[PDB]
Symmetry: C2
Subunit: 105 residues, 2 copies
């Protein structure tokens, strides 16, 4: 097991069944977070106070408390260009689609 | 294994070695999140778009992608009353000390 970090996650829309509508992008890099959250907690993981406390207690008695989790701390959107039912050409922005950074929470 | 949710986490400061200074609180309920993040994703877990996508892919091929994680989505602070080195009586607020809600991220 490794230290919490951002790994790759290639997303393919051609598998969504949106083929009669979507124009671009047809795939994108979404990324994902995976890894161990434990001392020492490197600054980039930006732990919260609660995270620091929970990691301490889990460090003292793993049975009592589980470790914190490596999750996306900041995400960005992506816009999708498609042709809707009415045949209009829409450019829609979707929030929280790309992982910008991982941290322990 | 159960569904992502807020469990209890009783924190005891008398174990911090802050005894010559801290007055109150000496213990508090910090809570913690624990549980499975998988379909169906109940509304209270407030998943992000990225979470919905990652859960889908993990649902289609668990080897490729790991599930999302049950973590604190909103936290509140607590204030601590202590007597510092100079013998001043300080009332300090600490951010992100109590888990208000858990979600899948």
């Amino acid at each position: 097991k490794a230290r919490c970090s951002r790994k790759a996650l290639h997303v393919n829309f051609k598998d969504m069944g949106w083929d009669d509508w979507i124009i671009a992008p047809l795939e994108y890099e979404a990324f994902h977070c995976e890894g161990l959250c434990e001392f020492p907690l490197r600054s980039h993981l930006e732990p919260t106070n609660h995270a620091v406390i929970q990691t301490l207690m889990n460090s003292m008695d793993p049975e009592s408390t589980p470790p914190t989790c490596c999750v996306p701390t900041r995400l960005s959107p992506i816009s999708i260009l498609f042709i809707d039912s009415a045949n209009n050409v829409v450019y829609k922005q979707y929030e929280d689609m790309v992982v910008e950074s991982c941290g322990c929470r």
